[PDB]
RNA sequence: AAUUCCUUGUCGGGUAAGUUCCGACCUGCACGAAUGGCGUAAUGAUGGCCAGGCUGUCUCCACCCGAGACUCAGUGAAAUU
RNA sequence: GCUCGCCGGAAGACCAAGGGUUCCUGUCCAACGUUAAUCGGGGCAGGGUGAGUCGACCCCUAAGGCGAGGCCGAAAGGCGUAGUCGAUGGGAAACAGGUUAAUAUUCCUGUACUUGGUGUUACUGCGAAGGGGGGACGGAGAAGGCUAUGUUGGCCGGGCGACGGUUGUCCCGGUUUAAGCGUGUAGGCUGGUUUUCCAGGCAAAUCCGGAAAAUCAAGGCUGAGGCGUGAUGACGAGGCACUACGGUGCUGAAGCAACAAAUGCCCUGCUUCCAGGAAAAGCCUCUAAGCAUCAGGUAACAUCAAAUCGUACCCCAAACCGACACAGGUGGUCAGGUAGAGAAUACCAAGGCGCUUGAGAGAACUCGGGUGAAGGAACUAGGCAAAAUGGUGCCGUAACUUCGGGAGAAGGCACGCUGAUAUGUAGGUGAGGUCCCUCGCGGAUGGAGCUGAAAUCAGUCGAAGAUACCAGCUGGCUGCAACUGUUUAUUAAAAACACAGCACUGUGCAAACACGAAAGUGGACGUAUACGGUGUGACGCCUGCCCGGUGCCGGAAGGUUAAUU
RNA sequence: AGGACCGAACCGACUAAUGUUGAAAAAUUAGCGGAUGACUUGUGGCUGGGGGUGAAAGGCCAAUCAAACCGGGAGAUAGCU
């Protein structure tokens, strides 16, 4: 639910919080945890490669199952949990044989729901089947791009994909960006959508909130000196040149896709 | 007012110690130059 | 006007007397709408202006308590030429 | 040696880092000490640092470093796997008293504890570089139960007053004792035992996980303090004798209770929130390959072993970093009394100091302070500086507003001491006694003793009762930026830089982009509700007209055009 | 509950005076700002010179920064003193 804080002090007037009581108020599953140390945007050379990264709260990595290759063994959801490594939530499931795993939480999943994977699985949210056995025009998420490696598309808070056609060994999909892409008709996909749709309505409300996420302040560039940025300086506020990155690239329309390796699985890129 | 030199034995040996000088080609050339000059103390070991 | 050269523009308010300040007028030398326009409670070791209280800031300085300055003994510099 | 003054959340005490004999004793005064010097952190000589339990080494790992083969690179070399190093973190064990001129949890006395090896006896399923459990973890807040510690009374010893009084409700001092062992309380968490079965834990498994039954609810784990023992001991104010007036033998009374109370302990707990909170070993269990009249495992007793290195002294300073015996800088631990909300402030205890030139004089002028007739900003670029306001309770409080604020707005009244209400009240703490019980560190009742606010009435002293230290000046109009924050170390703290919010644009994952001759790494163990770049800068009402120029994004008829032939 | 309020430790540096061959190659005294957080601090580690880092001043990188320090080419060149 979306909750608006009262203005008892500056820095709380514009704070908007998203509260989900269904989440587990306890420790996570220890056996499925790993260490995750921060980098600060620096590579093995010690140089900064991505700016505006640093600090934040300590986090632990949850091992999530993006493959879903346990076929013929029904599982039951135990509880919903909060994951600091991603915007969406996760669910702890229990298989009949006694194994536990983490999966992305679909839209309308609760505790006690039953899920299954395989060719013969039922068409219900949370179930994973190859796109060959999924009807056309349905909504799916966590889509595999190559059979066996695990889902890579539609893993965010409230994203999903739509199957539009099936010609041969390939299936055409409409991604959340509007792109028309086609992949082989052997990749697994999960029915339903990722349920955190309210994630987009949150308002941080103050600078300190952004620092908690590990985001460092951004310096414009027109406020620098000519030796530091092409936008440079000047007596006052001049800016008499075309917008440009550091290192000299346009940033206002210039496309930068130069792959040319696939160039077949794209039809209607966007817009 | 805090000054520039803040002593620390552990950091002194790890930065200018004998073994630190022997771990690189350039470090071993420092010792060669000092041996030729005849320095009584090659490094800051002790 | 943090923007107005002519300029202390003109009128009114406040003062015995106001090139500053506040409110209007528009002849905008050379405002203007995300290198944003116009408003805005709260906040500020931020800029300008006016009152009450308060006083040696001042009319106009007087006395007093301490550390140097001055004399005696010991030690004993410097810029410059 | 007797007085005076200063610090006392230090200017006292104990360490790390760093220094390296500055420590103690004898002797010397040239140089060093901002003066003299018999003195010294100075010269010379001798002496001093005692550990199975403290620390290091050692076992284990974080960031990170190195890195057999390997991949890449003109050479040098770069990255990285298996591994191996790396504390600022995890991992067995000692307390009190006595003693030296200088060391001690290290020596002595008394009383304890831990991990290994060998051997004997009894009983036995033992076994890993593998599996599981455990180790193992955030912020804030709220109490309750305790201790350190303090105060008073009782008790024991001593005292009867340099000047009026002081045999009493009077004065001074002491009233101290550990680890270990036994007991398992306040309180916290979790339902137990038995049998059968199973696509999981890279194979196995009696262990972990999962499913289905039966039978009882009392089982277990964790846990401050208190009590007992340790202790017929040690310590002990004061006496009595050696006596160079530098010190040791001998002996030694009381050694209880009540109240108050932590920022420390129970607490790695409990409650609650979003930003969702290390790793590995020791340790406890389970089996594989293997070995079984052996070897190994558990328990008892005896015996042996626990090496090596550090240990002096300073450590908010004259010994460390600043060229100095330099108003500077430097992390952790201990936390007494009266007043007080307090680790502020004032005066003190334990303890430590008066800061390494002095003696006189009492001019101008400079520095740091106190007071002031009448006027009260007339000073000045400018109320710069100074003066002034200052506490608690009650009454009362405007425009405006995003309804939280503005606000401690402004302003007003009361504050000491004595007596009574009440020989000390409300409240807090709680003994004896009585009854009961799963008789125990139990429960109910009971109220002695101790401790102790606030208010009202009356009286009373001074010019002044929040009397000292301590401790907001207030109000009206207006520009800029929303706000808390950030910045030119050493002339600029701002209207500048960040900021939440908003928009455009790039990017379908071997992503764009960035560091790299390359390998590769970051982005990210993320996937368009995501990530990068650019401009604007909370919020409210809004954001008009122009695509000729330059850039960017599309388009194909034609013209022009490289290497090559 | 809070980048909430008053205020010590702790971290900062707005005003004035003194000092300016200073006690000090940036400090002292009296006031002043933040003080549960975008906070502060100990130990160790990583980023190297046309490069680093930078809530952005051309700031900082060992009292040195519009291109650090040391050695070398080197007795660079100087129609100028």
UniProtKB/Swiss-Prot annotation, chain A:
Region Disordered: start-end pairs: 27-52, 220-271
Gene Ontology cellular component terms for the protein in this record: cytoplasm; cytosol; cytosolic large ribosomal subunit; DnaA-L2 complex
Membrane-spanning intervals of the chain: none
InterPro entries: NA-bd_OB-fold, Rib_uL2_dom2, Ribosomal_uL2, Ribosomal_uL2_bac/org-type, Ribosomal_uL2_C, Ribosomal_uL2_CS, Ribosomal_uL2_dom3, Ribosomal_uL2_RNA-bd_dom
Keywords: Acetylation, Ribonucleoprotein, Ribosomal protein, RNA-binding, rRNA-binding
GO molecular function: RNA binding; rRNA binding; structural constituent of ribosome; transferase activity; zinc ion binding
The UniProt record lists the keyword Acetylation: yes
GO BP annotations listed: cytoplasmic translation; negative regulation of DNA-templated DNA replication initiation; ribosomal large subunit assembly
Record-listed N6-acetyllysine modification sites: 241
Superkingdom to which the source organism belongs: Bacteria
Residue stretches of biased makeup (Low complexity): 38-47
Further remarks about this protein from its record: This protein can be partially replaced in vivo by its H.marismortui (HmaL2) or human (L8, from the 60S cytoplasmic ribosome) homolog.
Quaternary state and interactors: Part of the 50S ribosomal subunit. Forms a bridge to the 30S subunit in the 70S ribosome, contacting the 16S rRNA. Interacts weakly with S6 in one of the 3.5 A resolved structures. In pull-down experiments interacts with CedA.
Family statement drawn from the similarity comment of this UniProt entry: Belongs to the universal ribosomal protein uL2 family.
Function: One of the primary rRNA binding proteins. Located near the base of the L1 stalk, it is probably also mobile. Required for association of the 30S and 50S subunits to form the 70S ribosome, for tRNA binding and peptide bond formation. It has been suggested to have peptidyltransferase activity; this is highly controversial.
Record protein name field: Large ribosomal subunit protein uL2
Organism: Escherichia coli (strain K12)
This protein's encoding gene: rplB
Curated annotation (Swiss-Prot), chain B:
GO molecular function, one term: structural constituent of ribosome
Disulfide bonds: none
Protein name: Large ribosomal subunit protein bL34
UniProtKB keywords: Ribonucleoprotein, Ribosomal protein
InterPro entries per UniProt: Ribosomal_bL34, Ribosomal_bL34_CS
A GO CC term attached to the entry: ribonucleoprotein complex
Domain of life: Bacteria
Family per similarity comment: Belongs to the bacterial ribosomal protein bL34 family.
PANTHER family reported in the protein's UniProt record: LARGE RIBOSOMAL SUBUNIT PROTEIN BL34M, MITOCHONDRIAL RIBOSOMAL PROTEIN 34 FAMILY MEMBER
